[PDB]
Design a binder for this molecule. Structure first.
Ligand SMILES: Nc1nc2c(ncn2[C@@H]2O[C@H](COP(=O)(O)OP(=O)(O)O)[C@@H](O)[C@H]2O)c(=O)[nH]1
Ligand SMILES: [Mg+2]
Length: 176
């Protein structure tokens, strides 16, 4: 069974790094591909082989009209936000969940918090504190998930690859 998973969220949340890390088994560092592409993974999680088509999107305001053109035939969505970006977290309820439901009202959602490795980073915490902001905690993320009716809430880091295999395993689990 061939599954289709669309990845949505704000620019710089780490969507492309997440997809390259997972499929390639490596963090793309500084040079991240700039072409918005689709990826694939042949994975079997307690069954027979499954091909997971992974679709990256152009998250910026400029693509608001063209982005939903990749949504038709989608099996599951990954709404992404930076755990070290409250602006991207508010955009879950503000932008991403209304837009996903607009075009696909019955399609399952997995809420994904990225840059998990930066949540304990002293420099990142200091920068946020100056702007009177705090990183998103697991209870905050889980509440937003339940609010936006997400099937599951998951955290990960494409840098350390921690929680990454789970994200796409649960994407398959939200389908089937
Ligand atoms: N520390 C850390 N940096 C990351 C992670 N994922 C992406 N990045 C960085 O975050 C920025 C955004 O990456 P990118 O995939 O292009 O974001 P996109 O616009 O959502 O696709 C880049 O500077 C990446 O190097 C992560 O899990 N942890
Ligand atoms: Mg990208």
């Amino acid at each position: 069974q061939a599954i289709k998973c669309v990845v949505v969220g704000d620019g710089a949340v780490g969507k492309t790094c997440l997809l390259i890390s997972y499929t390639t088994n490596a963090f793309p560092g500084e040079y991240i591909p700039t072409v918005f592409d689709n990826y694939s993974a042949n994975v079997m999680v307690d069954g027979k082989p499954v091909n997971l088509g992974l679709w990256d999107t152009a998250g910026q305001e400029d693509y608001d009209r063209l982005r939903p053109l990749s949504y038709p035939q989608t099996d599951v969505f990954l709404i992404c936000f930076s755990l070290v970006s409250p602006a991207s977290f508010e955009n879950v309820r503000a932008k991403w969940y209304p837009e996903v439901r607009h075009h696909c009202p019955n399609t399952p959602i997995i809420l994904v918090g990225t840059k998990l490795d930066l949540r304990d980073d002293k420099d990142t915490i200091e920068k946020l504190k100056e702007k009177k902001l705090t990183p998103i905690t697991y209870p905050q993320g889980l509440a937003m998930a339940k609010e936006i009716g997400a099937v599951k809430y998951l955290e990960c880091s494409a840098l350390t690859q921690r929680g990454l295999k789970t994200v796409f395993d649960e994407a398959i689990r939200a389908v089937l």
